[PDB]
């Protein structure tokens, strides 16, 4: 179920590709919601579902007094939320310009509920989230495996693999804490954690099991209107700030920075995206590379662009896994497609056999991703 250069590839060639690939100089992984679904995570679609099923007042006000969606479109489960927050800032700044002190109520209620659904669907474990004994659960059956498999396909004098994802929650950090592996996601210390580029370039020397981490959703990173961000336990941050977001139902000020909103200029100085995409750009600009994606929602405009440039590195055999790939092709054939859907279907249909895309379906899940990677052989020896 692998397509490259407009032609199919066989299982033996797939295995040879994998075996050759594991030993390349550099390897990296990015993934969307191909795994968080099993763990119980919530995506933007679930945010829309909850907003539909819990808020009739604001949704009805939008439907008629603003006319920002139709019933059929909402039923189709395709409405956007990040652009909705952008237009919410538009409306509310217009109100603060002309000072309409009634609309402010509804729009700030919408923002409160929205950012609530954003920063309150990242737990996956209820109020147990702040407790201890987290990584040990077996619900990470395959997750943990991945990290292990990617710290054995190595030889002395090689850099650690780089990892990317779209996870709001901290599932993979939980697996790391379980396995005792030395991850890295920007900060150092316990009492004080401050952003520093230099902290992203730390490597260990045995006198090893480790790996890297980089979240697109980013922020345990709290800013109490102090122009700075710091990190401490989920339990402390819970006892301190988000407790007030439990039984108050008040307005949401942008104290601590999390960025699901598309219009970056809504927060013109957002400074967590830059590092993640600097890392991604560095990862593109190298031969002997590999990127995997599996049911990665092609919904970001800035993620469908660097990849088209990335195709111009041949040994960058960019990989795709998408069980529901029929929708994009069907839309392209008749009536055109969306923006990122068109971008990815254009990525695939580049004459190179380097571009590799998987649309197998039931076999494209995270289970295939974990199982396909084999374990290393220390001494191949002479096989003749």
Ligand X SMILES: NC(=O)c1ccc[n+]([C@@H]2O[C@@H](COP(=O)([O-])OP(=O)(O)OC[C@H]3O[C@@H](n4cnc5c(N)ncnc54)[C@H](O)[C@H]3O)[C@H](O)[C@H]2O)c1
Does residue 318 bind ligand X (CB under 6 A)? Answer: no
Q: Which does 377 bind (CB under 5 to 8 A by kind): ligand X, a second copy, none?
A: none
Does residue 121 bind ligand X (CB under 6 A)? Answer: no
Does residue 35 bind ligand X (CB under 6 A)? Answer: yes
**Angle (CA) 250 36 255, round 5°:** 30
Q: Binding to a second copy (CB under 8 A): which residues in 295-314? A: 301-302, 305-306, 308-314
Closest CA to 79 of 68, 87, 65, 88: 68
Q: Binding to a second copy (CB under 8 A): which residues in 228-287? A: 230-236, 262-271, 273-275, 277-278, 281-282, 284-287
Spatial strand order in the sheet of 2-4: 7-8, 2-4, 356-358, 319-321
**Which residue's CB is nearer to ligand X, number 34 or number 161?**
34
Cα separation, 65 vs 47, whole angstroms: 22
Name the segment binding ligand X (CB under 6 A); options: 60-68, 129-137, 253-261, 348-356: 253-261
**Angle (CA) 370 374 378, round 5°:** 145
Does residue 295 bind ligand X (CB under 6 A)? Answer: yes
Does residue 17 bind a second copy (CB under 8 A)? Answer: yes
Q: Binding to a second copy (CB under 8 A): which residues in 129-188? A: 132-135, 144-145, 148-149, 152, 159-160, 170, 173-174, 176-177, 179-180, 182, 188
Does residue 360 bind ligand X (CB under 6 A)? Answer: no
Minimum separation from the CB atom of position 236 to ligand X (A): 22
CA 360 to chain centre: 22
CA dist 101 to 5, 108, 342, Å?
A: 58, 11, 42
C-alpha distance across the termini of the chain, in Å: 33
Give yes or no for a contact between 371 and 8, defined as CB atoms under 8 angstroms apart.
no
Give yes or no for a contact between 310 and 291, defined as CB atoms under 8 angstroms apart.
yes
| Residue 128, both tokens | 């147990």
Does residue 37 bind a second copy (CB under 8 A)? Answer: no
Q: Which does 46 bind (CB under 5 to 8 A by kind): a second copy, ligand X, none?
A: none
Does residue 161 bind ligand X (CB under 6 A)? Answer: no
Closest CA to 176 of 185, 168, 166: 185
**Which residue's CB is nearer to a second copy, number 46 or number 275?**
275
Q: Which does 265 bind (CB under 5 to 8 A by kind): ligand X, a second copy, none?
A: a second copy
Closest CA to 161 of 181, 137, 134, 188: 181
Does residue 292 bind ligand X (CB under 6 A)? Answer: no
Does residue 34 bind ligand X (CB under 6 A)? Answer: yes
Q: Which of 348, 366, 369, 373 binds ligand X (CB under 6 A)?
A: 366
Q: Binding to a second copy (CB under 8 A): which residues in 338-367? A: 339, 343, 346, 350-354
Q: Binding to ligand X (CB under 6 A): which residues in 169-228? A: 216-218
Torsion of CA 202, 203, 209, 213, to 10 degrees: 30
Residue 34 is classified by DSSP as T
Q: Which of 10, 11, 53, 191 binds a second copy (CB under 8 A)?
A: 191
Q: Within 326-379, where are the H helices? A: 326-333, 339-348, 366-372
Name the segment binding a second copy (CB under 8 A); options: 41-49, 161-169, 199-207, 243-251: 199-207
Q: Which does 217 bind (CB under 5 to 8 A by kind): ligand X, a second copy, none?
A: ligand X
For 259, residues 6+ apart whose C-beta sits below 8 A from its C-beta are 217, 218, 267, 270, 272, 273
Q: Which does 1 bind (CB under 5 to 8 A by kind): a second copy, ligand X, none?
A: none
Interface with ligand X by CB under 6 A: which residues?
A: 32-35, 37, 43-45, 80-82, 166-167, 216-218, 259-261, 264, 267, 272-273, 276-277, 294-297, 299-300, 303, 323-324, 366
């Amino acid at each position: 179920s692998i397509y490259q250069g407009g032609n199919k590839l066989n299982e033996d060639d797939f295995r040879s590709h994998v075996y050759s690939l594991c030993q390349l100089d550099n390897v990296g992984v990015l993934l969307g919601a191909g795994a968080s679904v099993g763990c119980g995570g919530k995506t933007m679609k679930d945010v829309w579902k909850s907003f539909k099923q819990n808020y009739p007042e604001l949704l009805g006000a939008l439907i008629d007094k603003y006319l920002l969606v139709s019933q059929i479109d909402s039923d189709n489960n395709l409405v956007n939320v990040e652009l909705l927050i952008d237009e919410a800032t538009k409306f509310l700044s217009v109100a603060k310009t002309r000072r309409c002190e009634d609309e402010e109520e509804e729009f700030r209620k919408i923002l409160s509920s929205l950012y609530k659904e954003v920063t309150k669907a990242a737990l996956l474990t209820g109020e147990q989230f702040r407790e201890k004994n987290q990584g040990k659960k077996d619900a990470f059956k395959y997750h943990k495996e991945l990290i292990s498999k990617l710290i054995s396909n190595r030889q002395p004098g090689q850099s650690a693999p780089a990892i990317f994802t779209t996870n709001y929650d901290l599932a993979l950090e939980w697996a790391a804490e379980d396995l005792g592996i030395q991850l890295f996601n920007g900060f150092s210390g316990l009492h004080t954690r401050q952003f520093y580029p230099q902290n992203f370039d730390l490597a260990f020397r045995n006198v090893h099991y480790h790996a890297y981490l980089y979240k697109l959703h980013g922020s345990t990173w709290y800013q109490n209107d102090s122009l700075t961000v710091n990190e401490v336990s989920a339990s402390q941050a819970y006892d301190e700030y988000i407790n007030d977001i439990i039984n108050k139902d008040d307005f949401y000020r942008g104290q601590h920075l999390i960025y699901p909103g598309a219009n970056k200029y809504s927060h013109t100085i957002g400074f967590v995206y830059g590092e993640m995409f600097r890392r991604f750009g560095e990862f593109i600009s190298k031969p002997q590379t590999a990127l995997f994606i599996n049911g990665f929602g092609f919904g970001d405009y800035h993620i469908n662009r660097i990849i088209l440039g990335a195709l111009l590195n041949p040994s960058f055999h960019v990989v795709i896994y998408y069980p529901e790939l029929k929708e994009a092709i069907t839309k392209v054939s008749k009536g055109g497609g969306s923006e990122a859907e068109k971008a990815i279907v254009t990525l695939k249909n580049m004459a190179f056999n380097q571009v590799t895309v998987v649309g197998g379906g039931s076999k494209a899940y995270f289970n295939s991703f974990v199982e396909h990677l084999p374990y290393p052989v220390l001494f191949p020896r002479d096989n003749i």
